[PDB]
Amino acid sequence: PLSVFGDRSTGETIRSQNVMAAASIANIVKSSLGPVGLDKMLVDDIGDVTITNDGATILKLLEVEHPAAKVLCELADLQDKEVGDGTTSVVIIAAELLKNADELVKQKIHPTSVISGYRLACKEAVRYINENLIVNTDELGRDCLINAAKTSMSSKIIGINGDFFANMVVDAVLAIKYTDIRGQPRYPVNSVNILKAHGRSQMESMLISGYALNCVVGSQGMPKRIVNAKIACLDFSLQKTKMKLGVQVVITDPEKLDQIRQRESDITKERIQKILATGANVILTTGGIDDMCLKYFVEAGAMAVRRVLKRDLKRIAKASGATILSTLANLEGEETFEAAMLGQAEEVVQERICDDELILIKNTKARTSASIILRGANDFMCDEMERSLHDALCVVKRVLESKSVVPGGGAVEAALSIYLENYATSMGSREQLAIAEFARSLLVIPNTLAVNAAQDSTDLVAKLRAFHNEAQVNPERKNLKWIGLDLSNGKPRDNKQAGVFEPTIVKVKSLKFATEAAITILRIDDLIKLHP
Amino acid sequence: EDIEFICKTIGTKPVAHIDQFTADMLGSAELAEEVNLNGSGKLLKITGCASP
Amino acid sequence: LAGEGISVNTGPKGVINDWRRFKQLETEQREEQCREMERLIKKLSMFLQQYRKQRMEEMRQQLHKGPQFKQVFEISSGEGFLDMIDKEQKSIVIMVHIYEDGIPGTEAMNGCMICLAAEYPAVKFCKVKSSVIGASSQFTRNALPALLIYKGGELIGNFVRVTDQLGDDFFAVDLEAFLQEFGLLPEVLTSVRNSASEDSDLEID
């Protein structure tokens, strides 16, 4: 009849297939949630190993075929990009929402009503979180940042080492702090250059009060350390001058060839002399430096580094006050290098790190920067440390930007479930079932934590729900809103007092993204797969 | 192919030779900034133009 | 026997589904046969000499890499071969290794390709069984050493029967020089790694 070249799935078949794919994706990463979660080994059939706990990384490395599973993977990636934390919780919540919504649909509830109920439940959950479950960080102080970093780094390779890594992360984030127009203190994470190097233990990871370059001097002749550095950042190569494409040298008088060839390098000689005549000590350029220019720097006792990365050069110039010069051309058509185009640093040292060397630009003036050197046991451990450290930095940035945090350990999810279950009776007649199922699906996070802890998930979640119900029914028991889970002892615990925090933005964005993904997948009721 | 839309929006007139590049060929705008979409890329926004 | 002008008419439009179903597999095989045509029978039938630098080059190659020696990728299927030769950038040279287990003159050039991959990160040395592709009897009897070189999606080096011009237990430098004879080779040590939105840095403003 149709005569279309492909397969067709219609009705409950395609819906069940989509829910199966989402559930499989959720079960892939369900075992890596919460402090009692465990990492995963990923092998790419070539011999490369990626030990990771990040949900976004796991879903990115895996090659997936089903479109709904791809939707969940992109959801995790988007959560990672826009927040930096909660990449596993968003996927689990979205899959649970999809499963419960499909159960409702199989109960002959129209998907439009389910979608409307889900949207209303998401709005009410966000409003309730922003009205009741937020804790202002103004009165908490640096302890709030430390606790947020420790909570973020739990369930990672740097978990128990939180007492030290949280201080390190907070110091780095505060170091890279800057303010802009509209009076907003903006924290540009990814300005912290994360350098990995196996060797000593995690305790030997260093927080550089400056910047760290994964580069060395171009020649062994130059000194490896300069005290009062005058950093000169350049964006052009220092090589023998070559005529451009449109210029060709044609010789008719033999006497001029030697002069031509001499000036061919005298041009670069003069440029280097102009640069060095102002007292520059450290010269960083993105382009290459050949042997003759390297010797020019050697004789003057300078420090020349070639093939410096563009982002690294920009960060060094911004921190040290130097201006990146793509050319030595001024507004008078001349070749000049003013002294004001020089950066300043308190030291530039080429340190040795496990039979390898890197350049440390220490204590730059006019701006404070930061870099991190992660010391581990092998490359895989260093990569996992870097991923966890990036997660912690993102969490600290979120806490510092928006001054609201919420208790962790499933407390917010349980409170939301209780409130939405109570609220569903006040809206609609058929979408109330959708709101109730949204509330029930919100309970998948504490259940997953308890399951990962190998404790009595049913009884523990029942106790948590009872605590939150008592909090929401009795006006005088508002202090019970912070009751979460203590996974080590398997008992409910006041997480706000215990120091388990996370940014409100993480929960809000995860809820919104999961609701949108569930709505998107729920609309599909007929799939046509054309034959390639 | 975006020249026509840009000129209709801003009010500029294209210039192909530096000799004819004058102030009368410019398009005044209230604001022109490159906003950041919460890590999802950068959008270059020009909002507010005389003679829209 | 009349009516030779059949004009099948309605027939095809009700059966083009099955016709295209067969045609897709026919074309899928067709890429494989057309690709293997350019090698299977295209050309099957047809004291400074001491190189003192060869020894120092071998010594430098012995210290190629620290982490691991790495192994040559083993292609497991024909369509895998097709979708790796067609994939990847056309500006890179991809070298394919043709061999069968047991034939002499193989392990030496396996080790040579291992050393080349260790030294050269750009090139994409890979190996695949001769029988997996499905070469003919003549290839399996007198064409085991085959050097398949890809560049731009098309062949630029098609060496076969290289034992006479290389030897039997040749070193890495020997095959490297042999490949360099036709200009086939395109022109620091980090700690472990460096690569860690787009917000980079600002200051006060």
Ligand SMILES: Nc1ncnc2c1ncn2[C@@H]1O[C@H](COP(=O)(O)OP(=O)(O)O)[C@@H](O)[C@H]1O
């Ligand atoms: N010390 C702790 N006690 C109880 N719960 C915690 C603790 N630390 C983290 N959690 C909870 O574990 C959950 C899982 O976090 P995790 O999976 O590590 O983050 P992500 O989802 O970004 O990978 C979080 O929702 C958090 O509330």
Ligand SMILES: [Mg+2]
């Ligand atoms: Mg986390």
